Design an enzyme around this catalytic site. Structure first.
Site, mmCIF file in Angstrom:
data_model
loop_
_atom_site.group_PDB
_atom_site.id
_atom_site.type_symbol
_atom_site.label_atom_id
_atom_site.label_comp_id
_atom_site.label_asym_id
_atom_site.label_seq_id
_atom_site.Cartn_x
_atom_site.Cartn_y
_atom_site.Cartn_z
ATOM 1 N N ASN A 44 0.857 -1.168 0.000
ATOM 2 C CA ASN A 44 0.000 0.000 0.000
ATOM 3 C C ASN A 44 0.902 1.230 0.000
ATOM 4 O O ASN A 44 1.861 1.284 0.759
ATOM 5 C CB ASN A 44 -0.838 -0.058 1.285
ATOM 6 C CG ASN A 44 -1.962 0.946 1.326
ATOM 7 O OD1 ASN A 44 -2.162 1.736 0.404
ATOM 8 N ND2 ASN A 44 -2.732 0.904 2.416
ATOM 9 N N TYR A 76 -6.286 14.882 -1.601
ATOM 10 C CA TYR A 76 -6.422 14.165 -0.349
ATOM 11 C C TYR A 76 -5.928 15.069 0.764
ATOM 12 O O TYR A 76 -4.865 15.672 0.645
ATOM 13 C CB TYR A 76 -5.582 12.883 -0.419
ATOM 14 C CG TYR A 76 -5.484 12.147 0.887
ATOM 15 C CD1 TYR A 76 -6.605 11.561 1.462
ATOM 16 C CD2 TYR A 76 -4.296 12.076 1.582
ATOM 17 C CE1 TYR A 76 -6.530 10.898 2.676
ATOM 18 C CE2 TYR A 76 -4.210 11.421 2.796
ATOM 19 C CZ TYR A 76 -5.328 10.830 3.341
ATOM 20 O OH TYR A 76 -5.216 10.198 4.566
ATOM 21 N N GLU A 85 -11.051 13.588 7.309
ATOM 22 C CA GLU A 85 -10.204 13.092 6.220
ATOM 23 C C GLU A 85 -11.047 13.198 4.963
ATOM 24 O O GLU A 85 -12.206 12.776 4.968
ATOM 25 C CB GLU A 85 -9.820 11.641 6.492
ATOM 26 C CG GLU A 85 -8.863 11.045 5.472
ATOM 27 C CD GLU A 85 -8.546 9.591 5.757
ATOM 28 O OE1 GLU A 85 -9.432 8.887 6.310
ATOM 29 O OE2 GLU A 85 -7.422 9.149 5.435
ATOM 30 N N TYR A 87 -11.356 13.250 0.400
ATOM 31 C CA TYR A 87 -10.884 12.752 -0.883
ATOM 32 C C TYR A 87 -11.709 13.386 -1.995
ATOM 33 O O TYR A 87 -12.950 13.301 -1.975
ATOM 34 C CB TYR A 87 -11.102 11.250 -1.007
ATOM 35 C CG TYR A 87 -10.534 10.394 0.102
ATOM 36 C CD1 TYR A 87 -11.205 10.273 1.310
ATOM 37 C CD2 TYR A 87 -9.375 9.637 -0.074
ATOM 38 C CE1 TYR A 87 -10.735 9.462 2.319
ATOM 39 C CE2 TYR A 87 -8.898 8.821 0.943
ATOM 40 C CZ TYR A 87 -9.597 8.743 2.131
ATOM 41 O OH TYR A 87 -9.159 7.932 3.154
ATOM 42 N N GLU A 176 -2.230 6.844 -5.244
ATOM 43 C CA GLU A 176 -2.309 5.727 -4.316
ATOM 44 C C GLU A 176 -2.276 4.446 -5.124
ATOM 45 O O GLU A 176 -2.789 4.384 -6.247
ATOM 46 C CB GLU A 176 -3.600 5.819 -3.505
ATOM 47 C CG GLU A 176 -3.829 4.690 -2.492
ATOM 48 C CD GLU A 176 -4.574 3.482 -3.033
ATOM 49 O OE1 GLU A 176 -4.871 3.386 -4.237
ATOM 50 O OE2 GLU A 176 -4.913 2.597 -2.214
#
Length: 189
Positions: A44, A76, A85, A87, A176
């Site tokens: 990841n 992000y 958080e 996105y 990502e």
């Protein structure tokens, strides 16, 4: 075996995190530019460039995004007080990163509808340690790999769903990957 690299480079904030340093290479480049290559379908990572603190700003990004499998390209970031958080997902591969989040409407901006979602992370890692906090998602229907993002439009849309964003922490244009392969070069301004 984890690696986190943060700081300022080329006049921009940068952040790169991975749980498998051997299968991903992040390169900080001039101005707002970074590259990443990942291979071996293992690990990841999340990395990119932007600002700390974030703001309601126009984020311009230009580059090439060549994923193979599970990966996304997104603005992000985080706020504190409250801890949020968020996105703004511009492109994604074989998995929609908002999967499992609760649908919460739509915003039309920068040439696409974005589907909005919200979700709660419980006793989860965060910029403040183990916390329970809200997430907001805007997922672009018209997937793309260059353009401009009006972050304020998203923040406003999210403020009409639940609690508003707090005081900005970091804000990046990120690539990502999750157990996949690919490469990308992006320049943020």
């Amino acid at each position: 075996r984890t690696q986190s690299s943060t700081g300022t480079h080329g006049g921009y904030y940068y952040s790169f995190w991975t749980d498998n340093p051997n299968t991903v290479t992040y390169t900080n480049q001039n101005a707002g530019q970074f590259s990443v290559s990942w291979s071996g379908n293992q690990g990841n990572f999340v990395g990119g460039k932007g600002w700390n603190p974030g703001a309601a700003r126009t984020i311009k990004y230009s580059g090439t995004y060549n994923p193979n499998g599970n990966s996304y390209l997104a603005v992000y970031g985080w706020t504190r007080n409250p801890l949020i958080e968020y996105y703004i997902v511009e492109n994604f591969g074989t998995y929609n990163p908002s999967s499992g989040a609760t649908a919460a409407g739509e915003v039309t901006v920068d040439g696409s509808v974005y589907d909005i979602y919200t979700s709660t992370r419980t006793n989860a890692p965060s910029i403040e340690g183990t916390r329970t906090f809200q997430q907001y998602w805007s997922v672009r229907r018209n997937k793309r790999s260059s353009g401009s993002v009006n972050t304020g439009a998203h923040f406003n849309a999210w403020s009409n769903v639940g609690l508003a964003l707090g005081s900005h922490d970091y804000q990046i244009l990120a690539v990502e990957g999750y157990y996949s392969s690919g490469s990308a070069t992006m320049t943020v301004s």
